[PDB]
Design a protein around this nucleic acid. Structure first.
Lengths: 103, 117, 142, 110, 150, 56
RNA sequence: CCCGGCGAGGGGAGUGAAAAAGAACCUGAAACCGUGUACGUACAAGCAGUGGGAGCACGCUUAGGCGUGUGACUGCGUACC
RNA sequence: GUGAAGAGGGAAACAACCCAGACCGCCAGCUAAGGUCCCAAAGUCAUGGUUAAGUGGGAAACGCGGAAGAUGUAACGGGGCUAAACCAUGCACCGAAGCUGCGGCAGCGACGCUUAUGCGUUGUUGGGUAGGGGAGCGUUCUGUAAGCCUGCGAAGGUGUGCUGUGAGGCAUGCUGGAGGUAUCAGAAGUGCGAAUGCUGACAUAAGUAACGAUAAAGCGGGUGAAAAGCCC
RNA sequence: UGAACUCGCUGUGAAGAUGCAGUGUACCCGCGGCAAG
């Protein structure tokens, strides 16, 4: 029981009952979200996609976090060219818990 | 009017020392030497950020090629069969499936061979 | 999400036996090194030794095309006044046949502690008999 | 139970006395006394005086039965250093650092 | 800087930087690359500018109701207590008493208090006018301010 | 004849590792007086091999 | 009061808000030298770090990771004006 | 045409050769030069051929030879390759910070409109030395300010969690003990990493040289805690 | 005395490499010496 699906430009493989961190979504922190673009579903038997996004497979998740990642410092430094540049980054992350998997 | 810079110097030196924290020898104690380490460490981090993409890409390439040759087919043939069968699973997921579920990878290689033939 | 990486503690390494009779030196060493490095398994990690153990037998039966049987020269330096010594493939076979393939594998494999570990994984024997049958080294066809 | 005893502004050097300190670090008083007595160092007697002071402090200011005492925490650290001027050849002057060390001994029953 | 121009050490042969005197800015017991001088910081403002600014301040105070116009504002005796009572009756704390003519009684009464300050119409500054929470005027003070502003 | 650069405290510790002294760990007890003394050395009071030798 | 050498110095007692306010005395930081904890280190070469990264020692709700330290290993990497 | 003033990928390592011009982030795809036996990512790809030379992987007149140099193989990077060497064709894969897919910042000209500002927008640009222009952060003090915080705890010091493209800001665990200061303006001896820059402290060599004419000290007794150096 | 977790050879390089790429070698730490760098 594990499903592979494309959510935010990258494909995630998740098993039932776990949580996944992905790109930010326009969904409330306490809202249910649906993923019908399920690229693959696997169980004791194997079902594969002849066409992307299966036919009826769907993943239901519940949003838990709408946070920001750990601080990453970008520093550019040019040797003997008199240049140092500093920048900070905290990529937004959405953490969800996969509550349901269809067939 | 005197403007003493002791507090500002202390703050900046402490920040640089914290950034350099964890290094070996004087690189973690001397500000004049630690400061250079922080900049070089950040440059290495910036380069390795890009390097991570290629490293993981080639790792997945190696994993999938190894699995395919274990089942008796080249990686290029495997990818061509997947494309012909319209399989959009990426290299990372292919490698992960090969590692975890051997039956899923067996089905993948079977479909790739069927598409090729 | 987070990348999976092979954990060295939970790694299963198979055992194989390879006969080098009528085998090209470089081509055989290539397969041996690939097996040692684990590029035949779906669990290989660059920082983890995942390959299998290979036992080479009949190391004195290797074959080289062309005049490499005698024109091949192995040089080595002892770090002394004039200690540079050259010995051809015939001399290497006469003295001990394992060293030619061992040097081939060492130069084929990457350098470093992991490279030395995978080189140690390899076990060479000039004769056709080995005392490692306890590991069930199924013969590898290649 | 601490019964700490420290001797400060010692004539000897911290580098020289650390050897004696490590010699008895973690040993019992009965062995340490004789070890310091038969040790061939000025730091030996310097640390023996501090050890005797610590044992006496434990006996008087705190519980008796000094027999079951072990030197748990013994250490030495540099203190104020005096500066002197010494002439040399060609009229040069060099600075001589008279070093002093504080020796701390903490001995406990447990 | 008190001292002498003697070179601390010979310029050549020594393993130390080039020095000419102990008074140099990068030396001790003397230095300061740019020593300050006693200078006048007064900034000239045109008479028209000053009058316009005063008119603007008065208009702003009128709009914000910070200026209160009243009749004769005098104290019977130079008593700070009487002045305090006469201000507490109208519930005023931070006030500028702008009066047409300066009277010793009121001046003495308000001198001790710091929240209440007395001044003549001629002796008024925009800084004080804006700073004070309220300004209380007299008829003569208003008329003379008007005729002076023109 | 002189250092091209100052060594490290790590290298100083490596050099000084062998500078540590050694404990005798060979205390001997007099058979008669029962007092601790170095082996083959007379006691502080002047006893050696049970029999006094200094007589002072 | 006690040790120490009718020393210096320190542990007790008292003063005092404070004695790591004790005359070397307000506040007391870095370079430098140590103590204790945990890890890595005696088969591995290099501007000494970095991306990845298992193991080990500490706590958490959950029984999987998450937080810190160490970090074997792996690809890249010949300081600053 | 490139470096200077451009990082990246190939040539192993080499500014000037080749491909390619980094606004920032994403564990996505594609390709250029260059590669696909492996080290080290990818064809032990196919078809028609040459090569017997380690040529490939240094050199001419002449008939593979001509072709010998000095620390160590050292004129393919190496292992090694008789096809893993070279000519022609095709189909595939790898291949960069280059392009594309998603998200974030800003200038420029416009039109549909807000009109001292948002933009349902539109296209583009944002490597950068000297230099030119514009927009901001840190601190002393003055007016604001005899206002406000403040011994139920200021500043400095010492760690942590957030916050902005950033100088830094915010609150807090412990020492501290009575000072600090909102917002907007005014002036700087206003921000240090090098100038064989100066002052004070501490590493380093290192517990190493050395302990200062090679006239020479010892023993019994005395004081003293300590006696070879003090006294008889 | 910029800092070092401070080995040799080949080629490169501001043109004489402990640190660049390849290559071989090397248990960690002291003491008495020579002085090629």
């Amino acid at each position: 029981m594990y499903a592979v699906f494309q959510s935010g430009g990258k494909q995630h493989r998740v098993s039932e009952g776990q949580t996944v961190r992905l790109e930010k979504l326009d969904i409330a922190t306490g809202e249910t979200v649906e993923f019908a673009e399920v690229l693959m579903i696997a169980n004791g038997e194997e079902v594969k996609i002849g066409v992307p996004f299966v036919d009826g497979g769907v993943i239901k998740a519940e949003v838990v976090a709408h946070g920001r990642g750990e601080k990453v410092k970008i520093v550019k430094f040019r040797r003997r060219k008199h240049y140092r540049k500093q920048q900070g980054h905290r990529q937004w992350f959405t953490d969800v818990k996969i509550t349901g998997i269809s067939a | 009017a005197r403007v003493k810079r002791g507090v500002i110097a202390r703050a900046r030196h402490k920040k640089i020392l914290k950034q350099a924290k964890g290094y070996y020898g004087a690189r973690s104690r001397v500000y004049r030497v630690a400061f250079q380490a922080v900049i070089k460490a950040g440059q290495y981090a910036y380069r390795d950020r890009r390097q991570r993409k290629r490293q993981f890409r080639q790792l997945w390439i190696a994993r999938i090629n190894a699995a395919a040759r274990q089942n008796g087919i080249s990686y290029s043939k495997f990818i061509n069969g997947l494309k012909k069968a319209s399989v959009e699973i990426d290299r990372k997921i292919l490698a992960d499936i090969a590692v975890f579920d051997k039956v899923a990878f067996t089905a993948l290689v079977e479909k790739a061979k069927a598409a090729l033939a | 999400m987070k990348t999976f990486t092979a954990k060295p503690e939970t790694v299963k390494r198979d055992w194989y036996v390879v006969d080098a009779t009528g085998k090209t030196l470089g081509r055989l060493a290539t397969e041996l090194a690939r097996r040692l490095r684990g590029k035949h398994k779906a669990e290989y990690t660059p920082h983890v030794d995942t390959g299998d153990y290979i036992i080479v037998l009949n190391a004195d039966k290797v074959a080289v095309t062309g005049n490499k049987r005698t024109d091949k020269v192995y040089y080595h330096h002892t770090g002394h006044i004039g200690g540079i010594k050259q010995a051809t493939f015939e001399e290497m076979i006469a003295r001990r046949p394992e060293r030619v393939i061992e040097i081939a594998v060492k130069g084929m494999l990457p350098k470093g502690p992991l490279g030395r570990a995978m080189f140690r994984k390899l076990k060479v024997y000039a004769g056709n008999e080995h005392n490692h049958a306890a590991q069930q080294p199924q013969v590898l066809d290649i | 139970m601490e019964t700490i005893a420290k001797h400060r502004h010692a004539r000897s050097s911290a580098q020289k006395v650390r050897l004696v300190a490590d010699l008895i670090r973690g040993k019992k008083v009965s062995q340490a006394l004789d070890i310091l007595t038969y040790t061939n160092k000025k730091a030996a007697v310097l640390v023996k005086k501090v050890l005797e002071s610590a044992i006496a402090n434990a006996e008087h200011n705190d519980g008796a039965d000094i027999d079951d005492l072990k030197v748990t925490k013994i250490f030495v650290d540099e203190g104020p250093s005096m500066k002197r001027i010494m002439p040399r050849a060609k009229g040069r002057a060099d600075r001589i650092l008279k070093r002093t060390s504080h020796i701390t001994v903490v001995v406990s029953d447990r | 800087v008190t001292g002498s121009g003697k070179k601390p050490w010979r310029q050549k042969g020594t393993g130390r930087a080039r020095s000419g005197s102990i008074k140099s800015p990068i030396w001790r017991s003397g230095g300061v690359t740019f020593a300050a001088r006693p200078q006048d910081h007064s900034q000239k403002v045109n008479k028209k500018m000053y009058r316009g600014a005063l008119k603007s301040i008065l208009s702003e105070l009128v709009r914000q109701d910070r200026l209160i116009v009243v009749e004769k504002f005098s104290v019977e005796a130079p008593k700070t207590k009487l002045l305090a009572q006469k201000l507490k009756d109208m519930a005023l704390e931070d006030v500028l008493i702008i009066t047409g003519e300066l009277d010793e009684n009121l001046f003495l009464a308000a001198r001790n208090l710091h929240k209440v300050d007395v001044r003549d119409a001629t002796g008024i500054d925009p800084v004080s006018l804006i700073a004070f929470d309220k300004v209380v005027m007299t008829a003569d003070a208003v008329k003379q301010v008007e005729e002076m502003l023109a | 004849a002189v250092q091209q650069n100052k060594p490290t405290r790590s290298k100083r510790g490596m050099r000084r590792s062998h500078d540590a002294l050694t404990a005798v760990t060979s205390l001997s007890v007099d058979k008669t007086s029962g007092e601790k003394h170095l082996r083959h050395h007379i006691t502080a009071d002047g006893y050696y091999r049970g029999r006094k030798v200094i007589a002072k």
